[PDB]
A = this chain, B = another copy of it.
Amino acid sequence: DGGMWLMQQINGQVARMKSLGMQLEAADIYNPNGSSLKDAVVMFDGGCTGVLVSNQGLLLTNHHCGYDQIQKHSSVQHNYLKDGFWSYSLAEELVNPGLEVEIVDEITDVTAAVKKELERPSGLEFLSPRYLSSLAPEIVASRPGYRYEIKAFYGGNRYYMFTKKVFRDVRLVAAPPSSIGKFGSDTDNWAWPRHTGDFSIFRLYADKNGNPAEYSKDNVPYRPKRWVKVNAQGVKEGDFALIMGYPGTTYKFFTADEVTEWSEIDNNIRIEMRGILQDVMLREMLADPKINIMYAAKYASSQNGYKRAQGANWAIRRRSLREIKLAQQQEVLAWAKQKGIATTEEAVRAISKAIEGRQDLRMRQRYLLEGILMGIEMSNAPAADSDIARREAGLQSIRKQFEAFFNKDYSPEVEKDQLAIALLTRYAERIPAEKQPISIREGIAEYGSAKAYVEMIFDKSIYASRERFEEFMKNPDRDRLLRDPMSRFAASVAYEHQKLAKEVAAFDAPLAAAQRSYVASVLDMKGQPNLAPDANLTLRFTYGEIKGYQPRDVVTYGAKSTLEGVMEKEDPNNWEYVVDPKLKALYEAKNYGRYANSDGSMPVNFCATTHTTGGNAGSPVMNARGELIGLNFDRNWEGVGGDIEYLPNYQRSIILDIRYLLFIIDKFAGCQRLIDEIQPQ
């Protein structure tokens, strides 16, 4: 069994938790009337998670989480992105502009209070945090240093309030080199086994009172109500593991047809188009370095969502994902019929036609998004400023647009040559001419092919070259700028996207209302304290054991990885698999200190049967005594379909061994200061 439970559901799980070997009370993990692990697990930069392990507000999270800060901080004269960063005193800890970290102080049941002021409307106000948390000050002393959070649970049958302390002075303490921070980021993405040291260190500051404060001299290290002491005594197969964090999004109550839409449209189209994108882009990178130092981030970001989508498809083909949801659908129907309530099948019937009604539109939407809006560069082309139709002020506006479209990281080369032609050609085959943007429709109709159309653009448009643009702004015409082929391509596609959004939003309300009804029946059947809701970026806990899995026949993945695995992957002619000289030296000297396993090997990562997803990156992984033993930073591709249905024998959370973390701080960095603060075991 799995699931992502609310902190209030701690009481119904403790029996099964202690059954796995947990030596903790339920009040240790959550206490509304006391200090607990709740006040030690924080949100980081909105989309990640962190944990305090200090007497002085020290924050542990992922490397790719705090990547933005380290990137800002890093230079040519001090490449922290390459060397890492290590503060040997509090005065060396660097401050970050606009960094927010939030701690939960109280979790409040507020379903009834919201349900009354709901009866008053687009039919989406009962789901949106836009309106829910606006009802917060009416119930609570309502803005000192806090933020009030109200979100929808169980499709809209529950509403909980999160009183939140919000820190704005979080300081970068330390980080490993990228060769350790994102080792294997290109091949080992969404993969197990894994040998990556994905971490980075921050600190929480508060004024003399200990309250959420802005960056100032006043600021003193925050002394937490509660923090998680680090345990470096080791981990073994079968050990109880506890993960707390802020998981982003799941779709636990998808019907048999919502799965199909999620399969045929959401993932398959993404796989199809991104596959073409990456095939071409890769080819052009292994032929001209200049392209590689630039299209790297774009290729990596695309390949990241691509591998997830085909991992999501793997659950459909091999794991019988849809059939499971169909079973669960029939059993709640059979339950409803036996009990004689009809507000269930109507909910299913309504969902079915909602998905049915928007099938053709969303396919057009995804093809436009994945195929053109993301892949094709021309979508950002400078559109005509509206006056052109002192005399008028937009000739100043369009080069401001040009030096944005053509500001930076865009290469007119590759688009022209294959990238746009390949994408548009496939888009043309998939979307009927009657349903594609008017610029593209006319373009292919006038030149016979999507190939010739793109060719016409770059031979007739202004923004096709740098020199051509300012050659043209020598004596600008107010006819050309209207009928410019690339400016029409960007405009028409954008308009088609805007149009597709509105026409499909008519199904947002019937779907959401039918879903709330459907979940309400399921919630009635299984009972709230036995059913975990979907993820909505709030504090959840999940538990399991440190266990590997059986990927296929005759193959078994272990639960723990070692430094040996790194050296087995070392390849100097691959930035992804480059091994840092000192790390290789430590491995040769076996200078692991006593951070090593019981068998002398140096631990790197381990995996557990916990249920994670979305933004649970940087989540603390705690042992049976409540002490920290690792940091979560990923999930295997075989468990991607866990966002729909948890996969017991395949889905695993990929965790950084906390002993490997300390090892880098100690044996690799030499920053003994942080070891003395973060007490291991």
A568 touches B555 (CB 8 A): no
- A564 CA to B548 CA in the complex, in Å? 20
A557 touches B554 (CB 8 A): yes
Chain B: minimal CB distance from A224 (Å): 35
Query: Nearest CB to that of A559 among chain B residues?
Result: B554
Chain B: minimal CB distance from A325 (Å): 22
CB contact between A558 and one of B555, B557, B561, B565 (< 8 Å): that residue: B555
- A562 CA to B561 CA in the complex, in Å? 27
Tell me if A1 is interfacial: C-beta within 8 Å of chain B: no
Q: Which residues does chain B contribute within 8 Å of A561, judged by CB atoms?
A: 553-554
CB contact between A564 and one of B553, B562, B568 (< 8 Å): that residue: B553
B555 touches A555 (CB 8 A): yes
Tell me if A560 is interfacial: C-beta within 8 Å of chain B: yes
A537-569 CB contacts (< 8 Å) to partner B:
548, 552-558, 560-562, 564-565, 568
B554 touches A192 (CB 8 A): yes
Chain B: minimal CB distance from A652 (Å): 11
- A430 CA to B268 CA in the complex, in Å? 44
A565 touches B554 (CB 8 A): yes
Tell me if A193 is interfacial: C-beta within 8 Å of chain B: yes
Chain B: minimal CB distance from A586 (Å): 17
Tell me if A488 is interfacial: C-beta within 8 Å of chain B: no
Q: List 18 extra interface pairs beyond A555-B556, A556-B557, CB under 8 A.
A: A193-B552, A193-B554, A193-B555, A195-B553, A318-B568, A552-B565, A553-B561, A553-B562, A553-B564, A553-B565, A554-B557, A554-B558, A554-B560, A554-B561, A554-B565, A555-B555, A555-B557, A555-B558
Q: Which residues does chain B contribute within 8 Å of A193, judged by CB atoms?
A: 552-555
Query: Nearest CB to that of A607 among chain B residues?
Result: B554
A213-268 CB contacts (< 8 Å) to partner B:
none
Hey, which bits of chain A sit against chain B, CB under 8 A? 192-193, 195, 318, 548, 552-558, 560-562, 564-565, 568
Q: Which residues does chain B contribute within 8 Å of A192, judged by CB atoms?
A: 554
Q: Which one of A192, A318, A553, A555 has the highest number of Cβ atoms from chain B below 10 Å of its Cβ? A: A553
- A561 CA to B555 CA in the complex, in Å? 9
- A445 CA to B478 CA in the complex, in Å? 52
CB contact between A556 and one of B552, B556, B560 (< 8 Å): that residue: B556
A568 touches B552 (CB 8 A): yes
Chain B: minimal CB distance from A569 (Å): 8
Query: Nearest CB to that of A565 among chain B residues?
Result: B553
Q: Which residues does chain B contribute within 8 Å of A553, judged by CB atoms?
A: 193, 195, 561-562, 564-565, 568
Q: Which residues does chain B contribute within 8 Å of A568, judged by CB atoms?
A: 318, 552-553
Query: Nearest CB to that of A193 among chain B residues?
Result: B554
- A548 CA to B192 CA in the complex, in Å? 20
- A548 CA to B554 CA in the complex, in Å? 9
- A556 CA to B551 CA in the complex, in Å? 11
Q: Which one of A195, A555, A561 has the highest number of Cβ atoms from chain B below 10 Å of its Cβ? A: A555
Query: Nearest CB to that of A194 among chain B residues?
Result: B554
Query: Nearest CB to that of A286 among chain B residues?
Result: B279
Q: Which residues does chain B contribute within 8 Å of A548, judged by CB atoms?
A: 554
Q: Which residues does chain B contribute within 8 Å of A558, judged by CB atoms?
A: 554-556
- A556 CA to B548 CA in the complex, in Å? 11
- A554 CA to B195 CA in the complex, in Å? 10
Q: Which residues does chain B contribute within 8 Å of A560, judged by CB atoms?
A: 554
Chain B: minimal CB distance from A392 (Å): 50
Top 6 A-B pairs ranked by shortest CB distance? A553-B565, A193-B554, A554-B558, A556-B556, A554-B561, A553-B564
Q: Which residues does chain B contribute within 8 Å of A565, judged by CB atoms?
A: 552-554
- A555 CA to B194 CA in the complex, in Å? 11
Query: Nearest CB to that of A548 among chain B residues?
Result: B554
Q: Which residues does chain B contribute within 8 Å of A557, judged by CB atoms?
A: 554-556
Query: Nearest CB to that of A318 among chain B residues?
Result: B568
Q: Which residues does chain B contribute within 8 Å of A556, judged by CB atoms?
A: 555-558
Q: Which residues does chain B contribute within 8 Å of A318, judged by CB atoms?
A: 568
- A561 CA to B553 CA in the complex, in Å? 7
Query: Nearest CB to that of A561 among chain B residues?
Result: B554
- A192 CA to B552 CA in the complex, in Å? 12
Chain B: minimal CB distance from A236 (Å): 15
Chain B: minimal CB distance from A287 (Å): 10
Q: Which one of A195, A318, A554, A557 has the highest number of Cβ atoms from chain B below 10 Å of its Cβ? A: A554
20 pairs, A vs B, C-beta closer than 8 Å: A192-B554, A193-B552, A193-B553, A193-B554, A193-B555, A195-B553, A318-B568, A552-B568, A553-B561, A553-B562, A553-B565, A553-B568, A554-B558, A554-B560, A554-B562, A555-B555, A555-B556, A555-B558, A556-B556, A556-B557
Chain B: minimal CB distance from A96 (Å): 35
Chain B: minimal CB distance from A471 (Å): 33
- A432 CA to B292 CA in the complex, in Å? 30
Q: Which residues does chain B contribute within 8 Å of A195, judged by CB atoms?
A: 553
Chain B: minimal CB distance from A556 (Å): 5
Query: Nearest CB to that of A557 among chain B residues?
Result: B554
- A627 CA to B565 CA in the complex, in Å? 40
Chain B: minimal CB distance from A70 (Å): 28
Chain B: minimal CB distance from A197 (Å): 15
Query: Nearest CB to that of A554 among chain B residues?
Result: B193
- A553 CA to B604 CA in the complex, in Å? 11
Q: Which residues does chain B contribute within 8 Å of A552, judged by CB atoms?
A: 193, 565, 568
- A322 CA to B169 CA in the complex, in Å? 57
Q: Which residues does chain B contribute within 8 Å of A555, judged by CB atoms?
A: 193, 555-558
- A562 CA to B555 CA in the complex, in Å? 11
Chain B: minimal CB distance from A346 (Å): 37
Chain B: minimal CB distance from A189 (Å): 16
- A296 CA to B561 CA in the complex, in Å? 38
Chain B: minimal CB distance from A195 (Å): 7
Chain B: minimal CB distance from A637 (Å): 15
- A557 CA to B551 CA in the complex, in Å? 11
Q: Which residues does chain B contribute within 8 Å of A554, judged by CB atoms?
A: 192-193, 548, 557-558, 560-562, 565
